[PDB]
Amino acid sequence: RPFTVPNIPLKYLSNSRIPNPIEGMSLSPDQTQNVQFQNGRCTIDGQPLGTTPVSVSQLCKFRGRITSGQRVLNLTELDGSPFMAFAAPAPAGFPDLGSCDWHIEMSKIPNSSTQNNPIVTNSVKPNSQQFVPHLSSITLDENVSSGGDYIGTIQWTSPPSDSGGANTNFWKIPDYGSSLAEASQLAPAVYPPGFNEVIVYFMASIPGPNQSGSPNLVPCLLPQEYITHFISEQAPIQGEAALLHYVDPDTNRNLGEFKLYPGGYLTCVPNSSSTGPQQLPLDGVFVFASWVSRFYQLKPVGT
């Protein structure tokens, strides 16, 4: 009932859009820019939004049936329950990595084989028209030899096909697909809130090329283990923001001030235009300070 944040250092926590360790914090390239992720979305009183799952083990996964010799994956839930389009862009944990191709790996469940490799490689173009997860299906790039119940994941990403040579861009989400009066019901956009404040993103890496030849970094608004805490704790909100300290666990010296908003996003004020949380160590811990106002003024983060 008293609001809390898991007492673990950031270095040991998972991204909430890809199931990979957090590698750092950073700002969005345009610091006034809005995002609309469907995963890693949860109110701090514990309501998940979009397609967000409880556990990392169901993050960025898909599952469905496909007919032998065919390309169309009829989606279910990761446990095989049918997917009801009820307030939901796609099944739970379905990837929200927009603006890229998804080179996928999958396998049949349950296993029934006694030899051979059960893994199947394939590809998806989420900007393709038949990419309609919200209407329970996506069309793969190659036919699948053996029909069956496949569960799988994004194995690596590459720049998006049929985009006139655009780059990978993990700040965008896909188009889940809609028809007449059958619109996808998305988690709403997240906005910088004013008061000099920029949103902090937590970066992890997924394999795959990009046109700059740089690391392949996926941002997200919270670590997954924070979301799972909230879903469990369901602590009541008692203020317009929860003020948090990024505290050095060894020294008790707190390394920066942050406002964590009810909607499930975290902000800071950057010191200079160059600086920000990029420079913070990864072995600090976030600790709930007190409930505060819209109007609280954060000491800026950086050098």
Epitope: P193, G194, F195, N196, E240, V292, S293, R294, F295, Y296, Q297
Partner: single-chain antibody, 230 residues
Framework: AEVQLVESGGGLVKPGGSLRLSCAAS????????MNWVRQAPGKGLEWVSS????????YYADSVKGRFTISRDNAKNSLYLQMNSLRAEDTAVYYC?????????????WGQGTTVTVSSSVLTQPPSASGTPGQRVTISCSGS????????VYWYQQLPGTAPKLLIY???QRPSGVPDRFSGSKSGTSASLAISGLRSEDEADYYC???????????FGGGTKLTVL
Amino acid sequence: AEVQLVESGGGLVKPGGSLRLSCAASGFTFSSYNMNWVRQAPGKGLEWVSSISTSSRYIYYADSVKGRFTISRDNAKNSLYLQMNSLRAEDTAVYYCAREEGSVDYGMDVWGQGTTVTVSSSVLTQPPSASGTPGQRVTISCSGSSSNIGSNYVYWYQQLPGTAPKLLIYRNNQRPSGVPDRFSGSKSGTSASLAISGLRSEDEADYYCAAWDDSLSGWVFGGGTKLTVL
């Protein structure tokens, strides 16, 4: 769409009696904005009263009013209400309803004309007066403590004679559209100050500094500086 707030229900009330003020909004989608009640004893400074969020989730009261007044909004009827009970001489004021707007860090950017309430049968410190000459520059200062200016942002309102106040400054040193850059704000520690350059005779007005106070969990105001131009 003329953006407008109009209050009503004022008048003469007996001590110990009750009264319900209304505030009719038009020209902007009412349901999207936090609303406040700010009162003003005739010829005294601005006293924030109550504060109510878009869906009525966050409601705040001044301590001099806690237990006696009740803020509510009917978003259907584009209305803000202030029910006042156990009334006393201290409550005699002009009562303004005002709209918070996000682009100016939720400062009160649109006020109403006010309605007078007569009952019959301060924390932020400012200079009481200050004077300058045309062309010259004056600094209205404003000092608080760690729980208001020390923790929160400072806002500046200006008020011409017998008119509603006007947001001058938000976020310590930013100006709404239409506020000339002669005005500049600044904040260091538990203190803030407003600087007016190239002073003109239209700048003759009372100047108020405001800040949230986490100690009281409500707004707090300076005593008001009467700027006089000669």
